[PDB]
């Protein structure tokens, strides 16, 4: 028999402490190890589009209720118009999103793209295996339109359980998506074609058209990793990168919260339809939920007392339903704006903002189709094995106080490396990689009291 549950304190991780130091030099923390890793997000962009029939939902061809309904015919008109406007908004958001997805130009894409990088995202020319894994993991009901109506009809299995056949009972109509999944696949491939790249200035006109690996090295130097390290570790980088990518095959689990959100987007749509269906059986104190039954059992002077009760409650349900749809539609529109923003930042370029994208600085990110939205993956850079080193605010010529320099995108640290005869060395800011100080990694600055006074050998300036 399993053990009793155990009460426990919530752990609090403590940040690595770095003691403050006085004077002209200071302690510096730098990682000596790193790993690629990924994060994911799901941004819903749409609400499934439906319409209803205030003439088929309330009653079903009984002439007595039709005449009663006429006194309320304007409520249906309000219902229909409201739903119609909601659907127009959904189509607006789709077009607006795609307008930013498209690029004026892109690379062609072939198998083996990305060189040593594995790139499982490539299409089976298609959508992609990753998108299909998502769709398989999703528990959503079998699709509408074709064959449609004939899966309600006896020409099919008795085991069908689709609410879609109930679509033809309840008066529901499910409108088709505007986007067409094949066009959708074309749009996501177009985004992959914009890769390599964003670097090289704005990237808003020109298209670099360079190998994928090269764009990666460019991004790595954009985060303060020295160029020398990048050339030495090229295969290592690809190996760590593909380990992170390979983990995506385990990413389709219930502990993946982005995945969970996708499933709940599906769940919410299904629930809304089920609510209207269940209400068809809801008496309002009426003798029966069936109009024809109460007609058959009652003299007409009393018959429509029962019909009236039934009609009013049915209308009330429809009104509540519409209000809910309008709210959800608006939340989707706002969510779609966010998706558009990330496409124009997190995907189309490396970003310096932190915040957006996965939390590991930023390096290239990717996006794929997901039901009712976009699913993002963010490659990130996670530091490890931080060490503490001595560093100086800057250096100057002790023979001439106006000769003062400071490192660019890096630090001056006391050398701890046997290759360098010089007492100080430059390092990248993202990684511990000391190197000799040269003019390429430094700039002249105004003098400051904290700069070290070097009385001997400084190559930048030599004098």
């Amino acid at each position: 028999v399993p053990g009793e549950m155990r009460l426990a304190s919530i752990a609090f991780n403590h940040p690595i402490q770095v003691d403050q130091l006085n004077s002209s030099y200071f302690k510096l923390s730098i990682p000596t190890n790193f790993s690629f890793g990924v994060t994911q997000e799901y941004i819903q962009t749409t609400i499934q589009k439906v319409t209803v029939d205030c003439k088929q939902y309330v009653c079903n061809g009984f002439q007595k209720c039709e005449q009663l309904l006429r006194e309320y015919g304007q409520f249906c008109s309000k219902i229909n118009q409201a739903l119609h406007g909601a659907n127009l908004r959904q189509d607006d958001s789709v077009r607006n999103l795609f307008a930013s997805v498209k690029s004026s130009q892109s690379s062609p894409i072939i198998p083996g793209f990305g060189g040593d990088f594995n790139l499982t995202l490539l299409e089976p020319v298609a959508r992609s295996a990753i998108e299909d894994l998502l769709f398989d993991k999703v528990t959503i009901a079998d699709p509408g339109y074709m064959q449609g109506y004939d899966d309600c009809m006896q020409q099919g299995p008795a085991s069908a359980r689709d609410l879609i056949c109930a679509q033809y009972v309840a008066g529901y109509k499910v409108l088709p998506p505007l986007m067409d999944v094949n066009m959708e696949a074309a749009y996501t491939s177009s985004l992959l074609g914009s890769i390599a790249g964003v670097g090289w200035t704005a990237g808003l006109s020109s298209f670099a058209a360079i190998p994928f690996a090269q764009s990666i090295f460019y991004r790595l130097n954009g985060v303060g990793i020295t160029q020398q390290v990048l050339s030495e570790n090229q295969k290592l980088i690809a190996n760590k990168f593909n380990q992170a990518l390979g983990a995506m095959q385990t990413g389709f689990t219930t502990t993946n919260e982005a995945f969970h959100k996708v499933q709940d987007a599906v769940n919410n749509n299904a629930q809304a339809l089920s609510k209207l269906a269940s209400e068809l059986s809801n008496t309002f104190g009426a003798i029966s939920a069936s109009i024809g039954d109460i007609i058959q059992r009652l003299d007409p002077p009393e018959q429509d007392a029962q019909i009236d009760r039934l009609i009013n409650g049915r209308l009330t349900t429809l009104n509540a339903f519409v209000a809910q749809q309008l709210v959800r539609s608006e939340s989707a529109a706002l969510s779609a704006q966010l998706a558009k923003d990330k496409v124009n930042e997190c995907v189309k370029a490396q970003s310096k903002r932190s915040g957006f994208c996965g939390q590991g600085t930023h390096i290239v990110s990717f996006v794929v189709n997901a039901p009712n939205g976009l699913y993002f993956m963010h490659v990130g850079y996670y530091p490890s094995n931080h060490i503490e080193v001595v560093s100086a605010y800057g250096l100057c010529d002790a023979a001439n106080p106006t000769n003062c320099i400071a490192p660019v995108n890096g630090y001056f640290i006391k050398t701890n490396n046997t290759r360098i005869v010089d007492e100080w060395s430059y390092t990248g800011s993202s990684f511990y990689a000391p190197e000799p100080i040269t003019s390429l990694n430094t700039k002249y600055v105004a003098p400051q009291v904290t700069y070290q006074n070097i009385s001997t050998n400084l190559p930048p300036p030599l004098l």
Binding site: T51, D53, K55, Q56, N60, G61, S77, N80, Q81, H84, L88, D91, G144, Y145, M146, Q147, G148, Y149, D150, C152, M153, Q154, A158, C165, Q167, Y168, V169, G171, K173, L175, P176, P177, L178, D180, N182, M183, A277, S278, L280, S281, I287, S290, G292, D293, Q296, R297, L298, D299, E302
Partner: protein, 394 residues
């Protein structure tokens, strides 16, 4: 319909929903039966009971024609709560119950199913969970096998004294139950205002049963009343009106796409299919979690599945710039489409026919459409998308 919904003669161009087709219903089949005529002979002789002595007849498995019974008496009061009297005669049920009794018509002012009179306070009540009817009637001079009470009688009080001799507990009669006081009251009340008592058993905590009653003079023709209630059910509905099944000419196993039906008095409409036979066997019907019939067992040994019938969604493409329109029938596909519809939607669709009387229907990936023309053009934005890659050009 669209113009009326927008209260205007100029609806903005777009695609709009319109009401769906009713899907073409067809003539009925039934699986009711069987049984034998419900013997109503207990009413044909002897003296009917005092208001606290009711006779009851439970009817199951049997057939009836209540108008035959109506011919036997003159009815001086007909009323039915929660059901038309015509329907209760024509309805088929899991049970039919008849209560019958002597009743002077001098007391008819005090009797209705909702009455506050002493007859309902202490002698009889009916549940409102079931529809009810009431009949008051008298005996014809040729029905003399039925005979009169010495006097009509009733209990006008029923209470129990508390054992402490200071208070008393009233006992109104429970619906569908004899009053407790019947155990002490005599088969008739010997004199108006007679009262009776019985000591309560110690298991009851002591005290005394108390009851009293009143009488009404005997009349030239016997006067009587009836109470009727019915019970709903599914595969228990063996009580039915006498039925004739000639020239259906067939029932279950004859299809059909939308047919009216009744099974053991359970109405519905739908199409059936020959299928497996999930359990429980012999349970009559089969239902989903929403209490909608799923399918039904039959005496041909065949389980039938039921799909109800399938309505057809409709939408309309409207181009106000050219003042033209076209339509889409949705997922239904052109295989169920015909030049006219009995299914039906609105009294005409001739405005579509202004061009489409001259052309065949066109299938599309979304669905069958009328008056679209397959141009195979590629256009970036129709401002009238049909969904997917479909696009109707103005």
């Amino acid at each position: 319909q669209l113009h009326c919904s927008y209260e205007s003669f100029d609806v903005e161009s777009g695609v709009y929903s319109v009401s769906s087709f009713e899907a073409k219903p067809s003539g009925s089949v039934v699986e009711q039966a069987e049984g034998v005529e419900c013997d109503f002979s207990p009413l044909l002789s002897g003296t009917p009971p005092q208001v606290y002595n009711f006779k009851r007849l439970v009817f199951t498995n049997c057939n009836y024609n209540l108008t035959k019974l109506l011919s036997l008496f003159s009815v001086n009061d007909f009323t039915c709560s929660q059901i038309s009297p015509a329907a209760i005669a024509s309805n088929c049920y899991s049970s039919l119950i008849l209560d019958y009794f002597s009743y002077p018509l001098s007391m008819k002012s005090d009797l209705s199913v909702s009455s506050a009179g002493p007859i309902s306070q202490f002698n009889y009540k009916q549940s409102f969970s079931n529809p009810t009817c009431l009949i008051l009637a008298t005996v014809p001079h040729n029905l003399t096998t039925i005979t009169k009470p010495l006097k009509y009688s009733y209990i006008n009080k029923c209470s129990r004294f508390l054992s402490d001799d200071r208070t008393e507990v009233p006992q109104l009669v429970n619906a569908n139950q004899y009053s407790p006081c019947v155990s002490i009251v005599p088969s008739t009340v010997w004199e108006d205002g007679d009262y009776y008592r019985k000591q309560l058993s110690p298991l009851e905590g002591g005290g005394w049963l108390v009851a009293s009653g009143s009488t009404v003079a005997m009349t030239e023709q016997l006067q009587m009343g009836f109470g009727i209630t019915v019970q709903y059910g599914t595969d228990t509905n063996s009580v039915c009106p006498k039925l004739e099944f000639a020239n259906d000419t067939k029932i279950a196993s004859q299809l059909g796409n939308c047919v009216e039906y009744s099974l053991y008095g359970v109405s519905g409409r739908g199409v059936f299919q020959n299928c497996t036979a999930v359990g429980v066997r012999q349970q009559r019907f089969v239902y989903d979690a929403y209490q909608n019939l799923v399918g039904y067992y039959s005496d041909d040994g065949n389980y039938y599945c039921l799909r109800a019938c399938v309505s057809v969604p409709v939408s309309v493409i409207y181009d106000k710039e050219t003042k033209t329109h076209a339509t889409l029938f949705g997922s239904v596909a052109c295989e169920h489409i015909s030049s006219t519809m009995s299914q039906y939607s609105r009294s005409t669709r001739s405005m579509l026919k202004r061009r489409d009387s001259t052309y065949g229907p066109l299938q599309t990936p979304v669905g069958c459409v009328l008056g679209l023309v397959n141009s195979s053009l590629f256009v970036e934005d129709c401002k009238l998308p049909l969904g997917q890659s479909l696009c109707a050009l103005p």
